[PDB]
Amino acid sequence: DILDLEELREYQRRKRTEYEGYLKRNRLDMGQWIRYAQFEIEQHDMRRARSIFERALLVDSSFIPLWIRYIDAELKVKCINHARNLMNRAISTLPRVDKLWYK
RNA sequence: GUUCGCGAAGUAACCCUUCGUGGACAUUUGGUCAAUUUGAAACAAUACAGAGAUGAUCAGCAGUUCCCCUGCAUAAGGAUGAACCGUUUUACAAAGAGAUUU
Ligand SMILES: [K+]
Ligand SMILES: [Mg+2]
Ligand SMILES: [Mg+2]
Numbered sequence: 001d002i003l004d005l006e007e008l009r010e011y012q013r014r015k016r017t018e019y020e021g022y023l024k025r026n027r028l029d030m031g032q033w034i035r036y037a038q039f040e041i042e043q044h045d046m047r048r049a050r051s052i053f054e055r056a057l058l059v060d061s062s063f064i065p066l067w068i069r070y071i072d073a074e075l076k077v078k079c080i081n082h083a084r085n086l087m088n089r090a091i092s093t094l095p096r097v098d099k100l101w102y103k
Numbered sequence: 104g105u106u107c108g109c110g111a112a113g114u115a116a117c118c119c120u121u122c123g124u125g126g127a128c129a130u131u132u133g134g135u136c137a138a139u140u141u142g143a144a145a146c147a148a149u150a151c152a153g154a155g156a157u158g159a160u161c162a163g164c165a166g167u168u169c170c171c172c173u174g175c176a177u178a179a180g181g182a183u184g185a186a187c188c189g190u191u192u193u194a195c196a197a198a199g200a201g202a203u204u205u
Contacts, residue, residue, distance in 0.1 A: 103194085
């Protein structure tokens with residue numbers, strides 16, 4: 001498929017334009033947000049992935065699978081202290097959800 | 104420059120003409136900006152494609168958007184103005200049961 005960094009940049013531009021267009025036209029599709037963040041984790045660009053999860057939380061902070069995905073994504077890449085800040089924030093905004101406490 | 108005053112020479116003329124000189128009058132413009140190509144107007148042309156619903160053709164009216172255009176416009180029109188068609192995996196458990204690590 002992709003043989004060169006410039007070709008990776010072309011691929012990333014096309015996919016980012018696709019995902020951003022759909023999330024512009026309909027921001028409330030949380031699964032679309034999740035798989036865009038997953039795309040950026042596949043690109044190993046954790047800054048972009050974190051930004052997408054944060055924007056998704058700004059669209060809807062009450063949606064528990066989005067929180068769990070973000071926390072698990074931080075832990076999967078050994079970013080434990082980021083995960084600690086994130087989980088503390090998660091319980092701080094939603095203290096009555098048992099799943100976040102257990103996580 | 105005009106004018107008030109005082110000295111020198113016309114004109115012993117104290118006013119008029121000239122020269123020297125003290126004072127008053129009048130007091131800070133304009134630029135966000137330089138005169139052709141390299142600080143960004145658009146159509147048109149050319150080639151190829153081509154018409155929302157669906158079996159076919161067409162009237163529309165909306166909605167979402169970090170697209171706007173025409174219009175005095177909160178009217179109306181722009182193909183129903185366009186973009187929309189794609190992509191889709193975990194808040195993941197319980198009971199068994201068969202191969203097997205220990
Ligand atoms: K029509
Ligand atoms: Mg209309
Ligand atoms: Mg419309």
